Design a protein around this ligand. Structure first.
Ligand code: JA5
Lengths: 213, 212
């Protein structure tokens, strides 16, 4: 049983959470999405202001985030903050987080969240700032969806690159399935699949085998 | 001026993209994103999209005849066909910049254990094909990766919008016992830039030593 809360100024973007959809239906996980503006108090519902020290764009205010996280989090919560400046989120991270009772995912916009939010929370609970890859996004919402998908498929109840896969018909547009795959020889099939994966890994991901680039 | 077609057995998953799009960019004809249900191109009353893998193994493989028909209809010689997969080349910011000037992207979202390899190999004989991964984790299918690629690419299109960045601060100057670093209020802007540079260096060493 896992609970996941997501906090965002764009709750409508997290509707796709409805693979996680089948997990919710089975009653293994529960996912809830919260509008950050619920915790504002002014008429304009302001959540951002200009950065101290100068620079382009805006920074999300700590006051509003503090009130939201006070209500949603307990001392047992793992607070997840997607950010381009985070530690990398990997398959090992997904396995680690798959046995947690409660994830809270805080989605930033503009140029990010005041650093004191994570600092303050870390005095009360475990906090993890993470990146899902080295490309730039407008906000944390897409990253939250990737994290939820990677973690939920590992929950109890739900290396090298995979080579090419094939299914029927055995010949299509003059392209034939590799004959070894039709042969019923388990040893030969295993060997061929090993060689394919080796070739694909050295070509596409030489880093996984300890080579440059 | 970019057109993006996305093909998926879960079209509802791609709904937030359409809602992400600024009205002015659409009205100005800068961008169009269309989502298509793969089952439109199935051949049978049961709308089958997958079948057992040759050579055995777990899971299922998506059918070449169904995907071949879909791509035949949607793609042209000028299309850049994008296939998100954990076995792909890495998708980077450089990749996003390159694709931001394309006239037509088609994103083929797969599920189970992948799409029959002859689909991509056949397509590559008449258009450019790119199989890519968005990171080192496995997802059940390509839909969430498509959302990431679409956002990373479109934010670079004119109109539709090293080292790690250090911490940021805004009002109030003191909050729950924590003060904004005084240097940021100093009005010494050369000193502020040097402080930020050192914050970046330390954060990069701690969190991403691979970048150094
Ligand atoms: C303020 O939050 C963001 O703007 C944000 C941007 C990005 C890019 C990511 C790729 O790992 S994660 C993430 N969060």
């Amino acid at each position: 049983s896992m609970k996941i809360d997501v906090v965002t100024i764009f709750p409508e973007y997290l509707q796709p959470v409805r693979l996680p959809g089948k997990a919710i239906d089975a009653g293994l996980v529960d996912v809830a999405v919260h509008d950050l503006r619920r915790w504002t108090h002014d008429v304009h519902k302001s959540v951002d202001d200009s950065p101290y020290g100068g620079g382009p764009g805006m920074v999300m205010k700590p006051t509003v985030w503090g009130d939201a996280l006070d209500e949603i989090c307990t001392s047992e919560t793992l607070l997840v903050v997607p950010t381009p400046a985070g530690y990398p989120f990997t398959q090992e991270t997904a396995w680690q987080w798959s046995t947690e009772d409660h994830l809270v995912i805080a989605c930033g916009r503009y140029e990010g969240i005041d650093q004191r939010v994570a600092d303050d929370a870390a005095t009360r609970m475990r906090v993890r700032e993470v990146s899902i890859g080295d490309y730039v996004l407008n906000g944390g919402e897409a990253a939250a969806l990737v994290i939820i998908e990677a973690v939920l498929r590992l929950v109890p109840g739900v290396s090298l690159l995979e080579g090419p896969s094939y299914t029927r018909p055995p010949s299509w547009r003059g392209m034939d399935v590799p004959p070894v795959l039709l042969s019923g020889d388990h040893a030969k099939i295993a060997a061929w699949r090993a060689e394919q994966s080796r070739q694909r890994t050295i070509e596409r991901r030489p880093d996984l085998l300890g080579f440059d680039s």
